[PDB]
Enzyme design. Structure first.
Site, PDB file in Angstrom:
ATOM      1  N   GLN A  27       0.748  -1.089   0.022  1.00 48.64           N
ATOM      2  CA  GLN A  27       0.031   0.052   0.164  1.00 48.64           C
ATOM      3  C   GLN A  27       0.694   1.321  -0.131  1.00 48.64           C
ATOM      4  O   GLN A  27       0.542   2.302  -0.767  1.00 48.64           O
ATOM      5  CB  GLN A  27      -0.948  -0.073   1.272  1.00 48.64           C
ATOM      6  CG  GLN A  27      -2.118  -1.148   1.261  1.00 48.64           C
ATOM      7  CD  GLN A  27      -2.786  -1.336   2.597  1.00 48.64           C
ATOM      8  OE1 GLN A  27      -2.316  -0.928   3.612  1.00 48.64           O
ATOM      9  NE2 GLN A  27      -3.747  -2.000   2.284  1.00 48.64           N
ATOM     10  N   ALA A  28       1.886   1.269   1.011  1.00 47.34           N
ATOM     11  CA  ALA A  28       2.691   2.574   0.804  1.00 47.34           C
ATOM     12  C   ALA A  28       3.677   2.464  -0.302  1.00 47.34           C
ATOM     13  O   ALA A  28       4.132   3.436  -0.806  1.00 47.34           O
ATOM     14  CB  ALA A  28       3.605   2.501   2.224  1.00 47.34           C
ATOM     15  N   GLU A  54      -4.775  -5.770  -1.630  1.00 47.86           N
ATOM     16  CA  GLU A  54      -6.266  -4.655  -1.294  1.00 47.86           C
ATOM     17  C   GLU A  54      -6.643  -4.356  -2.157  1.00 47.86           C
ATOM     18  O   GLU A  54      -5.967  -3.172  -2.839  1.00 47.86           O
ATOM     19  CB  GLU A  54      -5.831  -3.882   0.095  1.00 47.86           C
ATOM     20  CG  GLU A  54      -7.079  -3.650   0.942  1.00 47.86           C
ATOM     21  CD  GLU A  54      -7.461  -2.290   0.774  1.00 47.86           C
ATOM     22  OE1 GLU A  54      -6.386  -1.439   0.376  1.00 47.86           O
ATOM     23  OE2 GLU A  54      -8.298  -1.846   0.511  1.00 47.86           O
ATOM     24  N   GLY A  92       1.588  -3.219   2.971  1.00 50.89           N
ATOM     25  CA  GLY A  92       0.511  -3.711   2.306  1.00 50.89           C
ATOM     26  C   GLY A  92       0.878  -5.159   2.426  1.00 50.89           C
ATOM     27  O   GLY A  92       0.763  -5.770   3.774  1.00 50.89           O
ATOM     28  N   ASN A 127      11.406   5.670   7.839  1.00 50.65           N
ATOM     29  CA  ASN A 127      10.134   6.470   7.940  1.00 50.65           C
ATOM     30  C   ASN A 127      10.665   7.308   9.417  1.00 50.65           C
ATOM     31  O   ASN A 127      10.077   8.598   9.405  1.00 50.65           O
ATOM     32  CB  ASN A 127       9.158   5.928   8.102  1.00 50.65           C
ATOM     33  CG  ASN A 127       8.531   5.259   6.835  1.00 50.65           C
ATOM     34  OD1 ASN A 127       8.865   5.700   5.656  1.00 50.65           O
ATOM     35  ND2 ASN A 127       7.686   4.180   6.880  1.00 50.65           N
ATOM     36  N   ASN A 133       4.832  10.717   1.461  1.00 44.17           N
ATOM     37  CA  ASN A 133       4.845  10.566  -0.087  1.00 44.17           C
ATOM     38  C   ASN A 133       5.727  11.488  -0.934  1.00 44.17           C
ATOM     39  O   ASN A 133       6.272  11.250  -1.747  1.00 44.17           O
ATOM     40  CB  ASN A 133       3.473  10.285  -0.159  1.00 44.17           C
ATOM     41  CG  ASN A 133       3.112   8.928   0.006  1.00 44.17           C
ATOM     42  OD1 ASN A 133       3.588   8.133  -0.371  1.00 44.17           O
ATOM     43  ND2 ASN A 133       1.774   8.834   0.515  1.00 44.17           N
ATOM     44  N   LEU A 156      21.912   4.656 -14.594  1.00 46.91           N
ATOM     45  CA  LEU A 156      21.824   3.973 -13.311  1.00 46.91           C
ATOM     46  C   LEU A 156      22.616   2.466 -13.401  1.00 46.91           C
ATOM     47  O   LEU A 156      22.897   2.378 -12.155  1.00 46.91           O
ATOM     48  CB  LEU A 156      20.275   3.524 -12.902  1.00 46.91           C
ATOM     49  CG  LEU A 156      19.268   4.819 -13.370  1.00 46.91           C
ATOM     50  CD1 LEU A 156      17.744   4.511 -13.023  1.00 46.91           C
ATOM     51  CD2 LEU A 156      19.554   6.129 -12.438  1.00 46.91           C
ATOM     52  N   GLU A 189      25.558   2.524 -14.789  1.00 43.96           N
ATOM     53  CA  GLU A 189      26.714   3.181 -14.195  1.00 43.96           C
ATOM     54  C   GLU A 189      26.873   3.212 -12.916  1.00 43.96           C
ATOM     55  O   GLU A 189      27.924   2.786 -12.034  1.00 43.96           O
ATOM     56  CB  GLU A 189      26.927   4.267 -14.935  1.00 43.96           C
ATOM     57  CG  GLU A 189      28.562   4.881 -15.097  1.00 43.96           C
ATOM     58  CD  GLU A 189      28.889   5.584 -13.986  1.00 43.96           C
ATOM     59  OE1 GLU A 189      28.101   6.207 -13.154  1.00 43.96           O
ATOM     60  OE2 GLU A 189      30.357   5.718 -13.670  1.00 43.96           O
TER      61      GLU A 189
END
Lengths: 428, 55, 439, 55, 450, 51, 55
Positions: free
Chosen positions: C10-11, C70, C143, C205, C227, C251, C253
């Site tokens: 979910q996050a 979900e 989630g 977080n 977010n 990326l 590299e």
């Protein structure tokens, strides 16, 4: 009568080649249009040595260049003479470089080097005869070391009776995008010492050292850096591209300079250190401006006047000056050194005074010669290897494609052999 | 051909065991790395000789 | 310069659509489909605006994968600020979710949904051939989280050969968390998805909580702020691929520049020149304080002392946007005089990277106009304590055999938990054996 | 004994039966995944048991 | 080029009378009985004035045999809004109605008039030498439906030889119709009408319903607006043989470059640059968005993703009215990029067909002065999802066994349904498995199917 | 018979190796134990599932 | 020795009913649940009879 090809490589070798032919066409001025700007009409042979025939007196190089990052070559194609090239150099794709030595050495390059060898094979015969190969090759990137090594290998099994000219940029602790480059060095000159004919220890941190400390230049950029190295190697190869009365030929240079045919790393220095920035604008006379010929701290290699063992020298002038002062300067700088009195080197009197018109200067003073300070350059390469390898660090990046440990072990065996032989020479 | 395929594996076992794993430097660890990759390619050939011959 | 990202949890979907909304707002990819800077509908693919594919008659879609069991999360995403141009044909969701655990979503009920999203991954893998890894968004217990990733990383490393990838692990915060068994799912995720990985970095977080309540003086700990901050940080990370400049390296590299070992695998993302409506008003931006404020403890995703934190690498990322002149001035004004405590027997070469063509700042957020970026992707060998504290809490809660009965009948055994403890103890004791400076 | 060992790993290689290709392409893909699982595990254990003998 | 036009079923007769009166207003056939432009009776004798020739009574009447056992559709084609402009005496009524039952038509209820339609096709097949095929207006189950088309196709393939059998196989929307059994006849279609045919097309009804309820916004969700738009598509396809000139890209190379294979038999249609009557207020006449909205699902008859359907052929068609040099001017508009996923063994270029003479506009509908068109008709593997939808419907119905005893005590067989399932599976696998790029047959060692 | 002899022969063909070294290879040794016991049980259930 | 024990586990296989098309969509889920529960217990018994008899 005498022809040299144009094969380039790398992401830095291509741009130093762009600057190279820019600054060696600075005294030539060959236009890309077709108006036939003749530098000297008696030098049809000495434009044909590098710029080969494509039409009636339209002389273009054997222009083939390869890399997987097209942005640099598309940038340098809009140069002064960036469009006088045949539409055959564009043999490339968009697979990316990524500073990956394995993809230039083993995986990605094995599907593209076939086109490069095919085009140099079908371009080599389109002249009178073939004499020389040349290459501006680098180690700062990842792919360039691998595909240059494999190209030198393929030209060994395909053209054995031909010289190749291998410029080689040595790693740098001072300017470096990535630091894996000890691994890009210890398995690059592992076989290059027994694959090519002659090589160059043009350094990068000694080169940046003389750019920063002993010149006091406020430009730590690739621009003036490429200007300096292009001018220095232009003064080097002016002898080979302008044979007045001396400056012997390709195998002839390998004959008189190479004993023990592994010890072919001569260090190209240059005397006056003229640079875009702080400039000195007097007519460079012979003695007090060629006094920067013998000083070992004033060249593109970490050396020492007393901890140094020369065994060949070369000096190719460009002004219309005399030779008596050159000879007495050579006598002083050759009789001054006690450690130079060894059982070898009876005669290295090769010196040129040929009247060649330069680009911004009116004369030159070039040094080409071997030493045993290339051993201490490889010694600091080896100590970086011991910094990186003794816990097998960062080897997971490269072992997944095609490599293992025993290639590195035989490379270290060859490094130990080189160190032992050069230490034998130092105490001989 | 089955008894051929078992007696040769017997002869890959028999005639050459690993050489005496004592060498007068750390290079014996290097040659033991050689022999463990050698047993890796013996793994390779032993999965060839049963699957590309009788399979 | 093409990559397709997947997002689970979910996050994970929350940070995914926040970051993709920021992408579409900062490239000018309007909800009208086309970008108005040129005349190509849907999007584009030129060098760096290359997050699209020719699906329709020149129609381009912001290619990404949004997955969660979900089902209401994709509905509340689809009624957001970027409403209808998400894909009407790959938003695949289940009916009933695992509901805040690991075992049920991984072994039992996800076993009939893994192949469906695998078929979707194959259908999007029949598309354009640009591939430079992956970008997987997940958490530990948000989630489904660990349940999808612990299976799909093994499935990616077995089914799709040995291809590189990259993942996003949201490190939890017990002060705003919603579970208690987070040591168990954390230790399980860390022995599973890290040994079958190519690149990763963990975002905490609680670090966002620290840099908000203790460094920015704001009083709102809501997941919308998280977010938006994750959108800013991952946008700054991806801006090397998203915009071309002086050192516009890929990326691939970056991931072939960073990781030294399969076990020594994680960086310390150092980006805290913290900003909002408060700390952006009438201030002055310079290349000294934002770079001097990196090694300090109250700037880090994972907590470490500066002298006790040993930098195996000190890679850096710049958003530039003015000149490379001041960056190559700060390479001597800041970067050259760095005799800070380092790791023995390793090179001490500082790396910088500047990427021009400014990504537009967030509209309607909190921060005012800001210029610089100091996203210094170093690494720290002393993050072994940052998981050793979780191993200590897991020891003090695991000898009581708590919450074991929910994780018995779904396929595993107590040997799996012993193996997870063994794996994290092996990683930590390997760091104090050879990772922390040794002889 | 080497005879029983390689004959028995051959016998369990006969326990790698020919497939049942009936079904759609998705059922054949599930069969393919089961095949990759069984081939991976069985040749890994074949080389492991060969190394436990010698290699 | 004087192909025989067959129209059975309620949709076939409905769009037959509609489209032939659209030809009447197109070719100028006034309700007087003859054109005021060319004074030859009935019809002309030009290259394009060739649909109307001398068969009936010297008057070159429009040429279409109208047969259906449902008598009310024959009544409303006899008593519609035109009474003499069709065949004055050649329309024969049907006596007993099939009444939405297909299986009665093939075995019980339509067998009395098969001799009469054989007499009609022998009358209309010994005519002028130009006959490139058959303009079949196929239906499934409305009137007789697939019955008369099926028996005509089978006896036309075993009795008339190997003539082309160009079909308009409508796959109607279940929302606007009333039958439920329609998957049974739509899957018997493969057995009785697909193998013995030689070329086919597709017309649909779902996309017209979707645009009429949402996009075009016309409050007419019945068969009438469907007829009004399928009349436009039938006029568009017949404009190849109807507009002869410098760019008469006619049926001759069209039938060549449509179908590559036996069971690549089913093309696709994407004609929708439509401008409505409520858009008929001098709006934008566009040559850019009609190129820019091609692979979007608005023009597609069936909602399919172009991202998964590879194309072995592509037939572009831009019929305008402005300039023949606008052919080149529109070649140099959008065709340069076109990075479209293709099979690795098919060509890339796009054919061009224009009809630069302006047409005569149909009045009293939901259309403006339409002059230009876009249609990217081709054979696509992206109809595999539509046929999988139909097969899902038939599998659910066969698990439910609806009207099985209705459809077995008349001449059918459960093994016949099995063979129809195998024919549908063959048409599937020539688009599902063989139709995708089959490059995985060169060689590799991983454990694949050697 | 020969099946159970095969299964127990493979069971005794998985010996516990010696504990020695600076605990690098021990985790790989545990992994080898658990996996190889899993597929020997898989071979057992397949063999007794056909019969 | 355990050739009758594998017949006992094949009887546990033989305790499997069909997945019941004549079965309510809630109820054959229960059949599947008691299936997976009983083979969880069977796997415990299987590693019992594997580990215990090896000594």
């Amino acid at each position: 009568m005498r022809e040299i090809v144009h094969i380039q490589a790398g992401q830095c070798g291509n741009q130093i080649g762009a600057k190279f032919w820019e600054v060696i066409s600075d005294e030539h001025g060959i236009d890309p249009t077709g108006s036939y700007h003749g530098d000297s009409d008696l030098q049809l042979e000495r434009i044909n040595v590098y710029y080969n025939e494509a039409a009636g007196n339209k002389y273009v190089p054997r222009a083939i260049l390869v890399d997987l990052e097209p942005g640099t070559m598309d940038s340098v194609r809009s140069g002064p003479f960036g469009q006088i090239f045949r539409p055959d150099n564009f043999v490339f794709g968009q697979s990316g470089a990524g500073n990956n030595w394995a993809k230039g050495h083993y995986t990605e390059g094995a599907e593209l080097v076939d086109s490069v060898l095919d085009v140099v094979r079908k371009e080599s015969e389109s002249c009178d005869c073939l004499q020389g190969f040349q290459l501006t090759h680098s180690l700062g990137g990842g792919t360039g070391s691998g595909m240059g090594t494999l190209l030198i290998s393929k030209i060994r099994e395909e053209y054995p009776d031909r010289i190749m000219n291998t410029f080689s940029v040595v790693p740098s602790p001072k300017v470096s995008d990535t630091v894996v480059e000890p691994y890009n060095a210890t398995l690059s000159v592992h076989q290059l010492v027994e694959n090519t004919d002659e090589t160059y220890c043009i350094d990068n941190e000694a080169l940046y050292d003389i750019c920063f400390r002993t010149l006091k230049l406020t430009t730590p950029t690739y621009g003036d850096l490429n200007h300096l190295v292009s001018a220095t190697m232009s003064g080097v190869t002016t002898c080979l591209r302008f044979p007045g009365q001396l400056n012997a030929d390709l195998r002839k240079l390998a004959v008189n300079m190479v004993p023990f045919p592994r010890l072919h790393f001569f260090m190209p220095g240059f005397a006056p250190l003229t640079s875009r920035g702080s400039q000195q604008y007097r007519a460079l006379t012979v003695p007090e401006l060629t006094q920067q010929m013998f000083d070992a701290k004033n060249m593109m290699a970490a050396c020492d006047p007393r901890h140094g063992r020369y065994l060949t020298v070369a000096a190719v002038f460009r002004g219309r000056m005399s030779m008596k002062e050159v000879d007495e300067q050579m006598l002083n700088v050759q009789n001054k050194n006690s450690s130079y009195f060894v059982e070898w080197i009876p005669n290295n009197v090769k010196t040129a005074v040929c009247d060649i018109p330069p680009r911004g200067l009116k004369m030159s003073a070039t040094f080409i010669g071997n030493s045993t300070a290339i051993q201490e350059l490889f010694k600091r390469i080896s100590e970086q290897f011991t910094a990186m390898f003794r816990r097998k660090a960062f080897l997971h990046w490269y072992t997944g494609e095609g490599m293992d440990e025993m290639e590195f072990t035989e490379a270290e065996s060859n490094m130990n052999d080189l160190v032992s032989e050069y230490q034998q020479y130092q105490d001989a | 051909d089955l008894l051929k395929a078992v007696r040769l594996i017997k002869f890959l076992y028999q005639s050459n065991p690993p050489p005496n794993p004592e060498g007068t430097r750390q290079a014996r660890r290097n040659r033991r790395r050689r022999w463990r990759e050698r047993q890796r390619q013996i793994h390779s050939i032993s999965e060839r000789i049963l699957s590309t011959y009788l399979g | 310069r093409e990559c397709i990202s997947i997002h689970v949890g979910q996050a994970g979907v929350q940070i995914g659509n926040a970051c993709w909304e920021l992408y579409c707002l900062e490239h000018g990819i309007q909800p009208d489909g086309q970008m108005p800077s040129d005349k190509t509908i849907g999007g584009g693919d030129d060098s760096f605006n290359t997050f699209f594919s020719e699906t329709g008659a020149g129609k381009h879609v912001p290619r990404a994968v949004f997955v969660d069991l979900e089902p209401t999360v994709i509905d509340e995403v689809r009624t957001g600020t970027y409403r209808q141009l998400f894909h009407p044909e790959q938003l695949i969701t289940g009916k009933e979710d695992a509901a805040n655990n690991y075992a049920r979503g991984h072994y039992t009920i996800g076993k009939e949904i893994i192949d469906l999203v695998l078929d979707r991954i194959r259908k999007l893998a029949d598309q354009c051939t640009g591939l430079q890894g992956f970008s997987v968004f997940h958490s530990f217990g948000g989630g489904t989280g660990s349940g999808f990733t612990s299976l799909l990383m093994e499935r990616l490393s077995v089914d799709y050969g040995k291809k590189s990838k990259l993942e996003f692990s949201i490190y939890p915060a017990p002060q705003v968390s919603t579970a208690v068994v987070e040591p168990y799912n954390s230790i399980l995720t860390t022995h599973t998805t890290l040994e079958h990985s190519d690149c990763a970095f963990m975002v905490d977080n609680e670090a966002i909580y620290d840099i908000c309540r203790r460094n920015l003086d704001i009083e709102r700990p809501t997941y919308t702020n998280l977010n938006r901050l994750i959108g800013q940080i991952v946008s700054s990370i991806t801006a090397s691929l998203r915009f071309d400049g002086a050192l516009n390296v890929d990326l691939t590299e970056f991931q072939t520049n960073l990781v030294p070992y399969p076990r020594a695998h994680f960086p310390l993302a150092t980006y805290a020149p913290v900003i909002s409506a408060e700390k952006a008003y009438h201030e002055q931006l310079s290349v000294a304080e934002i770079t001097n404020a990196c090694f300090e403890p109250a700037n880090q995703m994972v907590k470490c002392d500066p002298r006790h934190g040993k930098y195996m690498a000190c890679c850096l990322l710049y958003r530039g946007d003015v000149v490379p002149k001041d960056v190559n001035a700060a390479i001597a004004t800041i970067k050259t005089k760095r005799t800070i405590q380092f790791v023995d027997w390793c090179p001490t070469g500082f790396k910088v990277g500047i990427n021009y063509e400014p990504p537009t700042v967030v509209p309607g957020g909190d921060l005012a106009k800001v210029q610089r970026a100091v996203c210094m992707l170093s690494n720290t060998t002393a993050i072994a304590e940052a998981w050793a504290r979780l191993d200590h809490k897991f020891d003090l809660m695991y000898a009581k055999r708590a919450f074991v009965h929910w994780y018995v009948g779904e396929g595993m055994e107590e040997g799996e938990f012993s193996e997870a403890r063994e794996d994290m103890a092996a990683l930590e004791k390997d760091y104090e054996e050879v990772g922390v400076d040794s002889v």
